[PDB]
Amino acid sequence: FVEMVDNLRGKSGQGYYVEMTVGSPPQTLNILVDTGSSNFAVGAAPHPFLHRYYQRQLSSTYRDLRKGVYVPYTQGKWEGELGTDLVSIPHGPNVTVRANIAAITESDKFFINGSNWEGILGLAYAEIARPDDSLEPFFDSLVKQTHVPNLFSLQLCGAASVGGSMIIGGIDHSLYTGSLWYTPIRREWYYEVIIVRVEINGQDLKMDCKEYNYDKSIVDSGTTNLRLPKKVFEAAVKSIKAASSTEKFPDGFWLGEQLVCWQAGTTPWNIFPVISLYLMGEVTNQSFRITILPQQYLRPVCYKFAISQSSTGTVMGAVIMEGFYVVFDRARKRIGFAVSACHVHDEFRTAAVEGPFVTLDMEDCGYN
Ligand SMILES: CC1(C#Cc2cnc3c(c2)[C@]2(COC(N)=N2)c2cc(-c4cccnc4F)ccc2O3)COC1
């Protein structure tokens, strides 16, 4: 899949985008890759932040669905006009498909000033599509209309320009070391998974594991941080504070309300603990663990604390994903994790994927 390697770009904190074309003749756009939503939506008007936008008037293959879509999400909102058109991914499979496209005609806090992307590719499932689950997501259309296998994988590499790979329809084994370990997709809406145990520097938090997944845990390329439920975030910080008590930091730092800065070339990585999430495995009573470093959760801006509290559950965002090659195995309803060939690490500690472990009562970890 060499043609798809290095097909993602981005700027720090502004997401990862892939080149796409829409319409006939083809209009090229950069599109944010988002495993945490399920609509394909593109700028269709001359917003001042946009390098370019979809011009339906130039497309002979454009079809109007004569229906609007309104999408407020936690951090912004957009609204648009639904249609279909022919869509391709130049550095993807050599196919062209007719997909649903929301032509964005009004927005607030959606486009980023100074970014190089003009739309969003929602890769999650129809259950959370807008206006409802009858609006077929892009990936579903791709698989239905072609012989592209029902899976994709993401290598998000981080740094400021970031880079990565989206392998559509398969897996590139050069992008990871060791073995893939798979956790089941609990339910096909978000890419929902179940965390069964959490260790900070090898130390279990000992919470009712239900707490780790209240009300859900998801794998989300469209979120920068590792987000955690309050109750779990509270315990998580308490232990990270203690682990890092060598040096002192304000209360705002832990809330992501102020930055902490060290002199260039002298950050104390080693005073900060590793974070290990044990995920439900493929077999009864069997789990595995993924382990990330402070280089993943302490983000350059001076650094931000990139773990934060949540009201909608755990979100394994770019802080988690940049450690790993992540396989969205839709065909087998599972997500694979392996150590990424590009993850950033020091000489003493590196990101890990390890198994098998014995974990009982893992089904009691899911919130209903
Ligand atoms: C499930 C439903 C949705 C949605 C949704 C719509 N638009 C979005 C997003 C979600 C974001 C928010 O979180 C995620 N995962 N996608 C998102 C992140 C970004 C963004 C910003 C900075 C860095 N990375 C990003 F992905 C930009 C733009 C952006 O636009 C359907 O009704 C709720």
UniProtKB/Swiss-Prot annotation:
Induction trigger: Up-regulated by the Ca(2+)-regulated transcription factor NFATC4.
Peptidase A1 domain mapped to chain residues: 16-338
GO annotation, biological process: amyloid fibril formation; amyloid precursor protein catabolic process; amyloid-beta formation; amyloid-beta metabolic process; cellular response to amyloid-beta; cellular response to copper ion; cellular response to manganese ion; detection of mechanical stimulus involved in sensory perception of pain
Membrane topology qualifier: Single-pass type I membrane protein
Enzyme class, first EC level, given as a word: hydrolase
Catalytic activity: Broad endopeptidase specificity. Cleaves Glu-Val-Asn-Leu-|-Asp-Ala-Glu-Phe in the Swedish variant of Alzheimer's amyloid precursor protein
Modification sites for N6-acetyllysine: 67, 206, 210, 216, 230-231, 238
Main subcellular localisation: membrane
Protein name (database record): Beta-secretase 1
Species this protein is from: Homo sapiens
Lineage: Eukaryota, Metazoa, Chordata, Craniata, Vertebrata
Residue span relative to the full protein: 60 to 446 of 501
